[PDB]
Design a protein around this ligand. Structure first.
Ligand SMILES: CCCCCCCCCCCCCCCCCC(=O)OC[C@H](COP(=O)([O-])OCC(O)COP(=O)([O-])OC[C@@H](COC(=O)CCCCCCCCCCCCCCCCC)OC(=O)CCCCCCCCCCCCCCCCC)OC(=O)CCCCCCCCCCCCCCCCC
Ligand SMILES: CCCCCCCCCCC(CCCCCCCCCC)(CO[C@H]1O[C@@H](CO)[C@H](O[C@@H]2O[C@@H](CO)[C@H](O)[C@@H](O)[C@@H]2O)[C@@H](O)[C@@H]1O)CO[C@H]1O[C@@H](CO)[C@H](O[C@@H]2O[C@@H](CO)[C@H](O)[C@@H](O)[C@@H]2O)[C@@H](O)[C@H]1O
Ligand SMILES: CCCCCCCCCCCCCCCCCC(=O)OC[C@H](COP(=O)([O-])OCC[N+](C)(C)C)OC(=O)CCCCCCCCCCCCCCCCC
Ligand SMILES: CCCCCCCCCCCCCCCCCC(=O)OC[C@H](COP(=O)([O-])OCC[N+](C)(C)C)OC(=O)CCCCCCCCCCCCCCCCC
Ligand SMILES: CCCCCCCCCCCCCCCCCC(=O)OC[C@H](COP(=O)(O)OCCN)OC(=O)CCCCCCCCCCCCCCCCC
Ligand SMILES: CCCCCCCCCCCCCCCCCC(=O)OC[C@H](COP(=O)(O)OCCN)OC(=O)CCCCCCCCCCCCCCCCC
Ligand SMILES: CCCCCCCCCCCCCCCCCC(=O)OC[C@H](COP(=O)(O)OCCN)OC(=O)CCCCCCCCCCCCCCCCC
Ligand SMILES: CCCCCCCCCCCCCCCCCC(=O)OC[C@H](COP(=O)(O)OCCN)OC(=O)CCCCCCCCCCCCCCCCC
Ligand SMILES: CCCCCCCCCCCCCCCCCC(=O)OC[C@H](COP(=O)(O)OCCN)OC(=O)CCCCCCCCCCCCCCCCC
Ligand SMILES: CCCCCCCCCCCCCCCCCC(=O)OC[C@H](COP(=O)(O)OCCN)OC(=O)CCCCCCCCCCCCCCCCC
Ligand SMILES: CCCCCCCCCCCCCCCCCC(=O)OC[C@H](COP(=O)(O)OCCN)OC(=O)CCCCCCCCCCCCCCCCC
Lengths: 186, 85, 85, 78, 101, 81, 494, 39, 75, 74, 85
């Protein structure tokens, strides 16, 4: 388990701090003699918007892990989905709320599923020659291994298919399979 | 599925000749209603009951009306939506 | 008629699926033995095709409108031969 | 008083049907199931008794080995 | 039996229709097996086609009496129709199976 | 009366009131062509038809005069006693 | 020298002659077009010779040349039954497409001929290469010439059309390339006779399927990824349109038989319901919008979308008849869409300068020869029996039905709706009153040129509609190799 | 109205020796009435 | 007007203007409740319905050589 | 009363004759000539279809069973 | 004769349609009516051969569609229903 509120606060701080930095650059780059307190008067919304998004991101992903009791890539998706919605909330247009949510959710989930090399990669630390060798000539597999993942039917009828179907049909419809004979003399 | 034996022997004679009795009589009824009467059918036509009956059967149970409204024009409007929206 | 053609095609597809081909001798030699639900699927399918070509109440509207052709067409095509397909 | 000639399309259709009948008849294997003079030529030119299999096998093994070499070079230990 | 034609022998498989004990690095031997599985499926299929042809002749021969005189071909065709199908080699190339399992 | 129409429009079926002066001669050739093709079709049919019962000798069955299957049977059946 | 290399070399020679003959003789542009046409005839003659020698029941690639000089990217050429008919379609279509533009290309004629000749070489190389990465290289190579062809010879909206087809195809192809590169890394090559023996693990297959499917759905195209076609197939010059709909749409279909069926069997079978929902949706949506399309060339372009949905569903049927029917429909679509584009983009457009349906009516009265071929073509588009279109639609539809009945039943509704838009478009143009009162001048009927490109295309669809064995006999053995499955008493013989 | 007033069958169903069982295709196919339950 | 000289056509300005509106209509699409509902129905709902039905009936039935005493159902 | 058959085939007015655009030679003699030749060549092409080979083996196997009569008995 | 019934009306149709300019109005009527009347006589003869003598006639010319299990021929069967129709 994890504290969604506590983790969300840290998320708001990290990205609000970055937003505050970008707020300072806008204030520094102002042309008119506005002053040092332009940080929270003109550009203040920028820092607030950044704190709102990264806080929402860290809250909803932390909450998503707590609700599902799982730690997988999906949680980064809903976190981005909520963070993107918060980004679009500032514009005030419903399509931008959804579209911005979708992009943030998709991008952040895709990065987490594939493990983007932004900070390190999943180092195999194994014999790569043996890995590629095994995948290369694994030409024939046990049939059950295939059947475990595509199943029976749809043209996949391994030997003994009919006996199992006979058994399967009896357990469901309560009917014994006795096909008729086309030859009167039998 | 054989019925022909019962059709030849089991059918009562009244129901065998019933079409001919009806044919030979409604022909008299139809031929008398015209060229002798000719106002009675008119009285029926100019009744609201008869007027509606006449129109409904003249308009073929309104099938072409309902087919055109809810099938043909339905497909054309589906295409209009797909192309435009 | 193409609406009825679509149902006739699925019925042919159902015959092919069950019996391996669609020549008359094969179908009629194996008919007593095939699954009774299969016979219904094929039978209903070829009944709907028959409805359109023989202008039964569901798919009838074309035949009255076919009277727009020259008169010898109505006698030959839409009264005597093709309506009987 | 104008006369309409049969036209070139008449001779293509009639000639094509006549030519199809003639060409089909002369191309038959004859009363016995023996190939004609031209039948033996077409069978001979497109023989390839084992040519495709021989060449295909040689190429498959060569690209097999080439993949082996690249796998060796690409997975070499740093 | 009908003699095996000169053309027929040129395409007759020299290997059994199986993938057991076949070295997949041997290109020639693998393609030989694939050809044998494919050809065997077609033979079973073409067998049904010939049975159907005989059934067709007896139906038009026995007429009313076909329901009684064509049963032997009738049974044969249904058995072939229930069993023969061109399924390819590629499931059996990728999936080995044992009877003792 | 008869409708007016453009004389520049060429149609394979003739056009509007088309009858060439030589229509009988042309009809004779085409009918001859039709006979020739039909005869070829007749020859094919009389050789490739299949029957499973043959007609009785005294019955009106004119195909017995050209169909190969029946002609062979009748010729072979004449060898009796 | 292999006959397959001769196939790729002849058009390059014609390009060389076209670009140099000014130094041996102001040369008339008729000479240029004569060179290009004879170049396509010789390429067709070579493909006919190959087919006469081709063997129908060999699982070895035929007419291959040994290299023994391996490099990083070597062009290996080979042919079997599942590619031989696409090669024939390309070599028959290309001369007809050249004659269809004989008069309508008035400026930059040398550039037009060189692009079409280069297109011939590149499209042929797609069908003949024996390596999966070679397939991508030829598949993508046709884009710059196609971009230039549209932009130099297209109609008023040619810029937007040229950009759409380039960016759509590139975007989809980039997802296919990532799929191909993953295969190349696992197996060590993409040569067919090596990769087809590999057995990718199921999760790898799923993510390989996505990426190859994204590209093939952009190129089919499926409905919703098809606005590039509605632009490019309309704005293109007539010869460009014939090549784009007769051969370029067929690339994704032949691509399924090389890139999905042998190496992704488990992902293909597990995802067929997603493929079938998209193919079913495409069949209905495209049909309804075709019924409301008022640009005559756009209407013929949209019907290509509906037909390609049926061959796509037939190719995922995993049944012999569905797979053969898919190839049969692909070929029949090539003859019919070529003829209908000639009728609209080449006969109506040249005479009127417009493509709007509202201006046409009663053309039969003055153009009987056009209306006769146009009607036969519209029956082919409706899949009328005696055309190769019925044989392909029936076999494709039967395989789709047997694989997934609800998807086949919806796909079958095409028999009703293809008739609807084909008959509706025929009636409004050829029939539907006397000759349109918008025509100030009278119109001449088909010229000899127009007659003999329509007659030739109509000849192919009808002859193959009556004897489709001419293609099926060379398809049966090779197409067996892409089926996935087993019978219980037929498999594992001892 | 028809359901309330439609006559009962006025003849016993026709019977067939052996039910024509062999000539109707054997026990695998459908046969004719033969000393079965009444109707 | 487009390369080769074509025949004189009484090009009706209203019909030409209608043709121009159809080519340029994409430039004026907007998201409204109506357009979003229609777009969602055609793109999501109906396809997902066919997809769900195709999913649930995949492998349900087989007709081949099914006799009396057998079932079309396989699953 | 009937009219004489009229009309300008290929739009050639009755005074003049058809003018060749330059495509007719290659298309009629090269394109169509080659297709006609190929069709004749195709009559003499040997049958290499899987059906022909498989029918012959199927006939022998059904001769082995009591289905087909053996022309060469034992 | 049995094939000649099939192709004779088709032959007249292509002369009437694709060579109308050659035969004109009267030639077209003479060829079509002749080609249909001759077919009708052969049909009456066929009705006696097939129906009265109970000899069905099978005719197969060339295969139409040949795929694994489906073999559809250009083939015709004459039986009692055929000659009745
Ligand atoms: C392909 C097989 C059959 C396919 C069947 C397809 C069925 C559907 C289509 C049916 C509709 C047909 C179209 C209508 C044509 C007839 C009416 C018409 O409008 O005529 C216009 C017009 C004919 O008018 P015309 O006054 O008689 O001829 C004078 C013209 O100026 C013409 O003057 P021309 O000099 O230009 O004519 C010659 C022209 C012809 O071009 C061709 O021959 C190429 C096509 C090959 C045909 C095979 O080109 C050539 O110069 C030939 C040179 C090459 C000859 C071969 C060389 C062999 C070398 C190797 C040995 O067009 C034609 O020339 C038609 C030629 C092709 C006719 C084919 C046969 C038509 C039969 C119709 C019924 C077929 C269906 C039967 C039921 C199935
Ligand atoms: C969209 C078309 C994708 C283009 C084709 C991809 C080519 C294969 C890459 C698929 C990929 C990531 C997919 C991430 C999501 C994809 C993008 C998300 C939506 C994009 C908008 C599968 O990655 C998965 O592979 C599975 C095993 O197959 C593992 O189980 C998973 O843990 C792993 O994440 C990468 O793995 C690939 O690398 C090789 C190494 O040698 C692996 O062996 C394979 O695994 C292979 O596949
Ligand atoms: C399915 C594709 C086609 C395969 C079959 C190919 C044709 C086989 C032969 C068909 C019979 C012969 C047709 C003759 C042509 C009709 C008369 C004619 O010349 O038209 C010109 C006529 C000329 O008529 P006109 O001679 O009266 O000239 C004056 C009339 N106007 C004013 C128009 C000039 O053009 C038309 O008026 C009608 C245009 C449409 C033509 C209709 C096509 C006829 C062929 C139908 C094909 C049948 C397919 C069968 C269905 C498939 C089976 C499942
Ligand atoms: C998986 C795939 C699913 C895709 C789902 C979304 C489908 C979007 C498909 C994108 C691929 C085709 C894009 C075509 C864009 C061409 C265009 O807009 O007109 C060009 C236009 C033609 O438009 P025009 O001709 O109408 O008018 C402009 C006039 N000129 C050209 C003179 C300016 O030409 C241009 O160069 C102007 C474009 C300016 C920049 C626009 C770039 C947009 C490209 C987006 C690609 C981004 C991909 C990311 C994903
Ligand atoms: C995967 C990529 C996800 C999409 C990324 C781009 C979406 C986006 O950022 O929002 C843009 C768009 C807003 O559309 P809108 O503002 O209404 O158009 C006005 C044009 N003048 O937003 C949208 O229209 C998208 C709405 C549907 C999103 C469903 C997912
Ligand atoms: C018989 C049973 C009818 C029950 C009566 C139903 C009824 O009330 O219908 C009344 C309707 C009157 O017709 P209306 O046009 O409304 O009169 C105008 C007056 N200002 O008259 C009708 O609608 C009569 C409907 C006739 C057509 C019905 C379809 C055929 C019915 C077969 C009987
Ligand atoms: C709307 C159109 C629909 C068309 C449907 C397609 C047709 C199917 C329905 C009709 C079937 C009839 C076909 C003809 C059957 C017989 C073919 C034939 O001509 O056979 C004769 C010839 C030699 O016979 P052979 O096979 O050698 O027998 C000995 C074997 N040991 O064998 C040959 O090889 C000769 C081949 C020559 C061509 C055959 C004749 C064609 C007749 C039809 C032509 C119609 C077009 C007319 C064109 C205009 C004519 C004025
Ligand atoms: C025109 C209207 C035609 C309508 C046709 C409708 C078909 C159903 C009609 C049923 C009528 C049955 C035929 C009535 C005459 C039957 C008959 O027996 O006529 C006698 C004739 C000779 O027969 P045969 O067996 O040789 O007699 C001597 C035996 N020792 O038997 C015959 O074969 C004579 C009939 C010749 C048939 C060819 C007629 C061509 C016209
Ligand atoms: C591989 C073979 C080589 C690739 C093709 C290159 C062809 C270059 C040889 C042509 C030389 C030439 O002289 O072309 C001249 C022509 C226009 O010049 P001109 O006719 O003199 O202008 C007269 C104005 N009254 O100009 C042309 O004809 C050029 C037409 C454009 C070239 C094709 C369209 C571009 C295709 C993409 C090019 C970039 C990618 C290369 C693709 C190769 C295949 C993958
Ligand atoms: C009117 C005239 C119109 C054109 C007429 C030609 C149309 C032909 C259509 C059908 C062709 C059939 C002819 C044929 O079968 O040729 C076979 C020829 C000889 O075969 P072979 O010597 O064994 O060569 C084997 C090489 N692997 O096979 C060959 O090898 C021929 C090689 C041709 C190479 C062409 C070189 C470039 C040509 C430019
Ligand atoms: C139109 C009729 C054309 C004449 C057809 C009869 C000629 C002939 O006998 O060829 C038959 C030939 C062998 O027969 P096959 O298809 O292999 O199988 C027979 C199963 N009943 O099979 C063939 O090669 C028939 C090829 C038919 C091509 C028809 C083209 C029609 C053009 C109009």
């Amino acid at each position: 388990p994890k504290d969604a509120v506590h983790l969300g606060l840290k998320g708001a701080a990290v990205v609000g701090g970055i937003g505050l930095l970008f707020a300072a650059v806008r204030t520094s780059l102002a042309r008119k003699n506005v002053g040092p307190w332009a940080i929270f008067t003109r550009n203040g919304k920028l820092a607030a918007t950044f704190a709102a998004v990264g806080g929402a991101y860290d809250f909803t992903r932390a909450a998503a892990a707590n609700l599902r009791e799982k730690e997988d890539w999906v949680n980064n998706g809903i976190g981005g989905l909520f963070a993107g919605a918060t980004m679009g909330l500032t514009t005030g247009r419903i399509p931008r709320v959804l579209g911005f949510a979708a992009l943030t959710g998709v991008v952040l989930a895709t990065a987490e599923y594939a493990g983007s090399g932004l900070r390190g990669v999943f180092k195999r630390d194994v014999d790569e020659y043996e890995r590629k060798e095994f995948l290369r000539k694994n030409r024939r597999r046990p049939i059950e291994e295939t059947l475990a993942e595509i199943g029976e039917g749809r043209g996949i009828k391994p030997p003994g298919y009919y006996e199992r179907r006979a058994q399967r049909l009896k357990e469901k419809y309560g009917v014994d399979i006795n096909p008729v004979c086309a030859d009167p003399d039998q | 599925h054989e019925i022909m034996i019962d059709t030849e022997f089991a059918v009562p004679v009244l129901f065998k000749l019933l079409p001919f009795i009806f044919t030979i009589s409604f022909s008299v009824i139809a031929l008398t209603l015209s060229e002798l009467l000719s106002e009675l059918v008119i009285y029926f036509k100019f009744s609201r009951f008869g007027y509606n009956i006449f129109g409904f059967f003249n308009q073929r149970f309104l099938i072409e009306f309902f087919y055109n409204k809810y099938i043909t024009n339905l497909i054309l409007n589906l295409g209009g939506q797909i192309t435009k929206i | 008629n193409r609406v009825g053609d679509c149902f006739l095609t699925v019925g042919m597809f159902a015959i092919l699926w069950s019996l391996g081909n669609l020549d008359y001798a094969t179908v009629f030699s194996l008919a007593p033995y095939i699954n009774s639900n299969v016979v219904i699927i094929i039978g209903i399918c070829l009944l709907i095709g028959a409805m359109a070509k023989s202008s039964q109440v569901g798919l009838h509207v074309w035949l009255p409108m076919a009277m727009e052709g020259p008169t010898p067409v109505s006698a030959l095509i839409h009264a005597a031969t093709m309506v009987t397909a | 008083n104008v006369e309409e000639p049969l036209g070139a399309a008449f001779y293509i259709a009639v000639g094509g049907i006549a030519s199809s009948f003639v060409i089909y008849n002369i191309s038959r294997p004859g009363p016995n199931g023996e190939p004609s003079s031209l039948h033996k030529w077409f069978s001979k030119i497109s023989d390839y008794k084992d040519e495709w299999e021989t060449r295909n096998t040689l190429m498959a093994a060569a690209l097999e080995q080439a993949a082996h070499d690249k796998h060796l070079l690409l997975t070499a230990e740093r | 039996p009908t003699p095996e034609s000169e053309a027929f022998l040129a395409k007759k498989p020299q290997v059994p229709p199986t993938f057991d004990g076949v070295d997949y690095e041997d290109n020639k031997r693998l393609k030989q097996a694939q050809d044998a599985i494919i050809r065997e499926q077609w033979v079973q299929v073409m067998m049904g086609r010939l049975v159907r042809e005989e059934l067709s002749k007896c139906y038009y021969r026995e007429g009313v009496n076909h329901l009684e005189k064509c049963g032997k071909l009738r049974e044969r065709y249904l058995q072939l129709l229930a069993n023969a199908k061109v399924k390819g080699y590629l499931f059996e190339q990728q999936n080995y199976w044992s009877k003792e399992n | 009366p008869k409708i007016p129409y453009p004389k520049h429009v060429w149609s394979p079926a003739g056009g509007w009131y088309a009858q060439p002066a030589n229509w009988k001669q042309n009809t004779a050739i085409f009918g001859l062509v039709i006979f020739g093709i039909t005869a070829m079709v007749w020859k094919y049919s009389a050789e490739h038809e299949v029957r499973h019962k043959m007609p009785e000798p005294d019955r009106f069955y004119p195909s017995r005069y050209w169909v190969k299957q029946i002609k062979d049977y009748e010729r072979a059946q004449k060898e009796k006693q | 020298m292999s006959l397959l290399y001769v196939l790729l070399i002849i058009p390059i020679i014609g390009i060389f002659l076209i670009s140099t003959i000014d130094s041996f003789y102001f040369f008339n542009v008729s000479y240029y077009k004569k060179i290009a046409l004879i170049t396509t005839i010789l390429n067709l003659i070579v493909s006919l010779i190959i087919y006469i020698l081709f063997d129908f029941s060999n699982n070895q690639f035929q007419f291959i040349q040994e290299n023994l000089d391996l490099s990083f990217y070597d062009i290996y050429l080979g042919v079997d039954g599942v590619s031989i008919y696409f090669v024939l379609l390309t070599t028959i279509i290309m001369p007809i497409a050249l004659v269809s533009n004989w008069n309508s290309i008035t400026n930059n004629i040398k550039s037009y001929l060189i692009i079409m000749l280069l297109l011939e070489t590149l499209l042929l190389a797609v069908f003949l290469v024996l390596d999966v990465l070679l397939f991508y290289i030829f598949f993508e190579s046709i884009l710059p010439p196609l971009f230039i062809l549209i932009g130099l010879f297209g109609s008023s909206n040619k810029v937007r059309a040229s950009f759409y087809i380039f960016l759509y195809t590139l975007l989809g192809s980039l997802f296919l390339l990532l799929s191909i590169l993953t295969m190349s890394s696992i197996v060590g090559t993409t040569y067919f006779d090596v990769l087809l023996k590999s057995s990718f693990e199921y999760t790898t297959q799923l993510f390989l399927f996505f990426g190859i499917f994204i590209a093939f759905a952009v190129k089919t195209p499926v409905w919703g990824l098809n606005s590039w076609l509605l632009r490019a197939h309309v704005e293109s010059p007539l010869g460009g349109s014939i090549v784009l709909a007769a051969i370029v749409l067929k690339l994704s279909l032949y691509g399924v038989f090389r890139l999905i069926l042998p190496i992704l069997p488990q992902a293909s079978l597990n995802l067929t319901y997603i493929v079938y929902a998209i193919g079913a949706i495409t069949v209905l949506y495209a049909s309804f919008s075709t019924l409301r399309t008022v640009d005559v060339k756009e209407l013929i372009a949209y019907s290509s979308v509906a037909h390609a949905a049926i061959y796509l569903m037939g190719v995922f049927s995993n049944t012999i008849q569905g797979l053969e029917g898919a190839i049969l429909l692909g070929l029949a679509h090539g003859f019919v869409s070529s003829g209908l584009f000639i009728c609209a983009g080449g006969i109506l457009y040249d005479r009127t300068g417009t493509r709007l349906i509202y201006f046409f009516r009663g053309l039969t009265q003055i153009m009987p020869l056009f209306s006769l071929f146009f009607f036969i073509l519209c029956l082919g588009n409706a899949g009328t029996p005696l055309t190769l279109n019925f044989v392909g639609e029936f076999m494709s539809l039967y395989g789709t039905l047997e694989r997934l009945p609800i998807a086949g039943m919806l796909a079958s509704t095409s028999i009703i709706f293809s008739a609807a838009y084909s008959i509706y478009m025929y009636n409004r143009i050829a029939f539907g009153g006397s000759v349109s009162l918008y025509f100030i001048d009278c119109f001449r009927d088909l010229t000899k040129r127009e007659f003999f490109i329509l007659f030739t295309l109509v000849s192919f669809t009808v002859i193959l509609g009556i004897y489709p064995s001419f293609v099926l006999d060379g398809l049966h053995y090779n197409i067996s190799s892409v089926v996935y499955g087993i019978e219980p008493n037929a498999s594992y013989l001892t | 109205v028809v359901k309330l007033t439609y006559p009962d069958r006025v003849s016993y169903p026709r019977e067939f020796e052996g039910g024509l069982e062999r000539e109707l295709g054997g026990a695998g196919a459908v046969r004719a009435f033969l000393c079965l339950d009444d109707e | 007007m487009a390369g080769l000289q074509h025949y004189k056509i009484a090009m009706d300005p209203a019909l030409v203007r209608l043709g121009s509106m159809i080519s340029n209509r994409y430039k004026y699409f907007r998201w409204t409740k109506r357009t979003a509902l229609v777009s969602f129905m055609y793109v999501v709902v109906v396809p997902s319905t066919i997809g769900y039905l195709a999913y649930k009936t995949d492998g349900l039935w087989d007709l081949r050589a099914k006799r009396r005493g057998d079932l079309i159902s396989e699953r | 009363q009937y009219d004489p058959p009229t009309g300008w085939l290929w739009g050639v007015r009755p005074g003049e004759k058809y003018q060749n655009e330059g495509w007719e030679g290659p298309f009629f003699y090269g394109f169509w000539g080659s297709l006609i030749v190929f069709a004749i060549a195709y009559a003499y092409k040997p049958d290499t279809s899987i059906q022909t080979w498989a029918l012959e083996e199927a006939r022998r196997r059904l001769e082995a069973e009591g289905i087909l009569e053996d022309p060469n008995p034992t | 004769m049995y094939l000649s019934i099939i192709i004779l009306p088709l032959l007249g149709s292509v002369v009437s349609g694709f060579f109308g300019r050659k035969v004109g109005v009267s030639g077209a009527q003479l060829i079509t009516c002749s080609s249909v009347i001759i077919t009708t006589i052969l049909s009456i003869i066929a009705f006696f051969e097939v129906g009265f003598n109970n000899i069905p006639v099978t005719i197969n010319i060339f295969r139409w569609i040949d795929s694994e299990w489906f073999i559809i021929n250009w083939g015709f069967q004459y039986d009692s229903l055929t000659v009745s129709m």
